Structure formats: structure tokens, C-alpha cells
């Protein structure tokens, strides 16, 4: 991988392999979004960053996930090269925003483009906060001062307001718990494990007939390592688009909420 | 990846990934395990095929009995490591597939790993002995002088594992596979038996210990729809006895060993 010839923007290849495939012998889209995951720290590491700023590691401050919002058109097969290029851009004081484009190295066709919000959090307290000047200046020299975005369009659905499932859903994967493969290097559960949780309560014909085309996901609350999960799924429509909602087992406190659009194989 | 010269085994370098990391800052072993897959995928493919055209008109699959993977040391997030198998026949009973991992900047022999392979008919599930029309098939692709990644007398690869006696000291009970634990022929991957039989160590052991061997046998599949329990008692550096079996019934699945030694 490496930053294009204006340091604003990070491009990387990937060979898709045979454990990374789905019953379709295509990426599915959790390896897609771990995909995302590696581009996007690769691009932090070749501008200084380890991704907080000299500031955020001084306050005990974070980036954490809002919204992941994934469009793909074309899941590569494996064997296939896909190139992925990625940049970040300020949204004023709420947080910053991260966008990639998924292409075929073969062709220059995009096979995929995806969009997500981030904002900041003091890593003790869980309490979120409006970005500092100080912290802003530091970041704002590595993403491009005009707005370049992966959905431009006047009416995209990565903005889209996401409501709450209402009980009893259609259908549902009950008792999900996270293994020591679902934590990333800081024991906290790791953002692409909420997407599987959230398709675990597809039911399988679907995914049988069907290919995601996209998937919206709002991050509300994390799940501990110890905690158990619940998956509900409901049907809202040659298109299937469902509504979903991750709750604790217990108590049934919202820790995820997204919509889902399939197309017809 | 390639074959090497004299096409008898196949390389292939890796960078190891941000998300493929423990806190440790190094690959898990099951993403050592998932590189052992896809090399093991890669060498298959580079020389025609691991069923050959007979097996498939015989509804026959080469099957995991026992993995036994040894790591000295965890390559970092960022690392490159190499990583060269090769096959090797083992008679009417099977085959062997071998692995070892290096340093790309330093060369050192970083892990390395051993697998056994039987036949069986992917219907019935069937054991069979391999076929002399199956067998000439691929003992063209194998070195025909024994090559082994553990060549030692009386090593820990070849040993016999003993089933694990109620009451387990430790256990993880409800276990259940979800869609990425998934192949792409629906199957359990086998790399997800291994991230289950860790799953019962304590979280004390795991922050202070590295895990340096680990033997696993397979003895039945763990279907979509089933649920597991994992059981571990120590033995003994830490040893432990491993013990995976339906939730249910207790139908036996898995098998097997890890050591671990202080950080
Ligand atoms: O989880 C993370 O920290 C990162 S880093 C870049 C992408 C993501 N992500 C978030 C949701 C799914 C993937
Ligand atoms: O599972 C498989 O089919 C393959 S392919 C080569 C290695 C493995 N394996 C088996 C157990 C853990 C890894």
C-alpha cells in the first residue's frame, strides 16, 4: 500500500483468499469490512498516527464508530486482486468521516464504495465530546480541503435517519456471544463482528436467493466480552430491505440498529 | 506464492494484518492457522487441482484427522512471514501435508506445523483406504525422499491423546458456529475447532502465557445447527487437556493438548 502522489488519499491491493469466501466462492462482506479496517490503519501509520493525534493520547481521547455505511456491486472472487482507496474528512466540531472505493485491478471498474461517521469519546468515561481546535489542526493537514465524497448523490442513503424495531420482530438469532477471535488488539470487540450479528437473523433462504447490496449500521452502545447478544431481524419491502436491531440478552439495551437491501441473484 | 524449483513445494510471504492481531500485538494462532489454509489452497491449485478428477467420480474428500502446530515466535502487525508446505504419502492410510513459517528479513525458522489427512466419502462419510489409481494420481506432486517438518524420535506430533474425565477443571458451555465461521461449502472451517478448544483456557493463563504447542484430533464434524462445549483440565511451562463435545449428548468432536510457557 501507499498515499497517492498528493498525501491526501491511501491506495492498497488485496489478494482475496480461500478462507475470506463465502458459498458463492465471493468475498463476503465481513471480509470486505475487515478489508476497510486494514486499508484505513495502513493510512494512519504512514502519516504519524498510531488513529490519534498527539493531543487525543494526552486526554485519554478516542475515535469511535457512529455509522458504517457499505454498497457493494460486484463481491470479488477469490483468487481476485481488489484495489481499495481511502481518505478521511473533517465534519466540523461533531467528528471526522472516512470514505473508501473498492475497485477491480483487472478492468478500473468500482465493485463497491463505502462511508462511515466518526466521533470522539474520552476513553474512560464513554462521554462523548464536540472535537477540540487544537486536535482539529492536527489532522486537517491529511484530508483534502475541497469535499470529496463516495455518495455524493442529492439523495443518498448513507444519511438516512434509522428507526427502532418494534417487538415481535419477524425473525431472530437468539444467544450471541463474542470468542477471543472477535476482540481486536485491545480486548474490545471488534466493529465487523456487529455486522455478522446482524445477518446471523437473515434467514438462510434469503441468503440462499440473494446478494447484500447495502447495509447501514448505527453503533450505539459496545458489548463486553461477557455479555450476550440478541439479533432481530424484520421484513420492511425484486428487492428484499429489512430493519435490525442488536439488544444485550438481558435487560434488552440497544447496542446496534441498521437497515439491509438485497437484490435477487 | 510459487512452487519452488523443483516443483515438489510451494512459498508464499504474507503481511500480517491490523485486524488478524491479539493484544499482544501478534497473529493469533488461528490466524496462523488460516495462512496454513490458504498456502495449503494455493499449492493445490498451482499444480491442477485436493481431490483429483478419481475422487471426484468417486464422491471422495480428503479430511483433517489431526493438526499439530508448534510457534517459537508470533510474527508482529506489519511482519512479513514465508511460509513453505510441501505433501507427502503415508500409504493405504493417508497423506501429510507439512508447513513451515519464517522470518522473511532474518530467514530464522520462526513455527512450524504438521497435518494428517484421511479419505472418506463426502456422502456416507466413510473412511476408505486411499486407491493405487488415486494414489499415482498425486504422488507425482510429493518429494519422494521423506521431508518431514518434525523429524525428532518420539515427538509430540505422533503422541496419543486421552480423553478428558468429568469433571473439567475450566469450560465454555453454549458454543455456537455462525456464517463466517463458514467454508464455502457451508462447513465449519477447521480453524474454528481451535479458536473453540482456547476458548475454555482462563483469561489469566492467556494474559501471562504464549501458547507454544498445540495438538488437535478431529474426530466428527460440528454441524451448523449444533452446539458445543468446551472442556480443559491441566496436566502438568502449562499443559492442558482438551476436550470439545456436543452439548447435548456429549457426543465426542475434538481432542487435544496445548503448552504454554510464562511470557
Ligand atoms: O472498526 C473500526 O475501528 C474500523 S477502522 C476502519 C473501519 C472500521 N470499521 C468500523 C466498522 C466496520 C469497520
Ligand atoms: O481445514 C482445512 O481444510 C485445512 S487446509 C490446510 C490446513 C487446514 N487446516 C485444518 C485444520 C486447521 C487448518
Same mark, same amino acid.
Given at each position: 500500500?501507499?498515499?497517492?502522489?498528493?498525501?491526501?488519499?491511501?491506495?492498497?491491493?488485496?489478494?482475496?483468499?480461500?478462507?475470506?469466501?463465502?458459498?458463492?466462492?465471493?468475498?463476503?462482506?465481513?471480509? $470486505?469490512?475487515?478489508?476497510?479496517?486494514?486499508?484505513?490503519?495502513?493510512?494512519?501509520?504512514?502519516?504519524?498516527?498510531?488513529?490519534?493525534?498527539?493531543?487525543?493520547?494526552?486526554?485519554?481521547? $478516542?475515535?469511535?464508530?457512529?455509522?458504517?455505511?457499505?454498497? $457493494?456491486?460486484?463481491?470479488?472472487?477469490?483468487?481476485?486482486?481488489?484495489?481499495?482507496?481511502?481518505?478521511?474528512?473533517?465534519?466540523?466540531?461533531?467528528?471526522?468521516?472516512?470514505?473508501?472505493?473498492?475497485?477491480? %485491478?483487472?478492468?478500473?471498474?468500482?465493485?463497491?464504495?463505502?462511508?462511515?461517521?466518526?466521533?470522539?469519546?474520552?476513553?474512560?468515561?464513554?462521554?462523548?465530546?464536540?472535537?477540540?481546535?487544537?486536535?482539529?489542526?492536527?489532522?486537517?493537514?491529511?484530508?483534502?480541503?475541497?469535499?470529496?465524497?463516495?455518495?455524493?448523490?442529492?439523495?443518498?442513503?448513507?444519511?438516512?435517519?434509522?428507526?427502532?424495531?418494534?417487538?415481535?420482530?419477524?425473525? %431472530?438469532?437468539?444467544?450471541?456471544?463474542?470468542?477471543?477471535?472477535?476482540?481486536?488488539?485491545?480486548?474490545?470487540?471488534?466493529?465487523?463482528?456487529?455486522?455478522?450479528?446482524?445477518?446471523?437473523?437473515?434467514?438462510?433462504?434469503?441468503?440462499?436467493?440473494?446478494?447484500?447490496?447495502?447495509?447501514?449500521?448505527?453503533?450505539?452502545?459496545?458489548?463486553?466480552?461477557?455479555?450476550?447478544?440478541?439479533?432481530?431481524?424484520?421484513?420492511?419491502?425484486?428487492? %428484499?430491505?429489512?430493519?435490525?436491531?442488536?439488544?444485550?440478552?438481558?435487560?434488552?439495551?440497544? $447496542?446496534?440498529?441498521?437497515?439491509?437491501?438485497?437484490?435477487?441473484?
Amino acid at each position: 500500500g501507499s498515499l497517492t502522489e498528493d498525501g491526501l488519499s491511501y491506495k492498497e491491493k488485496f489478494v482475496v483468499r480461500s478462507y475470506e469466501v463465502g458459498s458463492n466462492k465471493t468475498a463476503t462482506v465481513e471480509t $470486505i469490512a475487515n478489508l476497510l479496517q486494514e486499508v484505513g490503519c495502513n493510512h494512519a501509520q504512514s502519516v504519524g498516527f498510531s488513529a490519534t493525534t498527539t493531543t487525543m493520547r494526552k486526554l485519554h481521547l $478516542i475515535w469511535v464508530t457512529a455509522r458504517m455505511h457499505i454498497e $457493494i456491486y460486484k463481491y470479488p472472487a477469490w483468487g481476485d486482486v481488489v484495489e481499495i482507496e481511502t481518505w478521511c474528512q473533517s465534519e466540523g466540531r461533531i467528528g471526522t468521516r472516512r470514505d473508501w472505493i473498492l475497485k477491480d %485491478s483487472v478492468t478500473g471498474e468500482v465493485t463497491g464504495r463505502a462511508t462511515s461517521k466518526w466521533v470522539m469519546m474520552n476513553q474512560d468515561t464513554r462521554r462523548l465530546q464536540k472535537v477540540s481546535d487544537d486536535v482539529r489542526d492536527e489532522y486537517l493537514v491529511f484530508c483534502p480541503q475541497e469535499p470529496r465524497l463516495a455518495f455524493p448523490e442529492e439523495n443518498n442513503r448513507s444519511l438516512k435517519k434509522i428507526p427502532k424495531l418494534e417487538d415481535p420482530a419477524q425473525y %431472530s438469532m437468539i444467544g450471541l456471544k463474542p470468542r477471543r477471535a472477535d476482540l481486536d488488539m485491545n480486548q474490545h470487540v471488534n466493529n465487523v463482528t456487529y455486522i455478522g450479528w446482524v445477518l446471523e437473523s437473515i434467514p438462510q433462504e434469503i441468503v440462499d436467493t440473494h446478494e447484500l447490496q447495502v447495509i447501514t449500521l448505527d453503533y450505539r452502545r459496545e458489548c463486553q466480552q461477557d455479555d450476550v447478544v440478541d439479533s432481530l431481524t424484520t421484513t420492511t419491502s425484486n428487492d %428484499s430491505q429489512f430493519l435490525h436491531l442488536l439488544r444485550l440478552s438481558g435487560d434488552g439495551q440497544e $447496542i446496534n440498529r441498521g437497515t439491509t437491501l438485497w437484490r435477487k441473484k
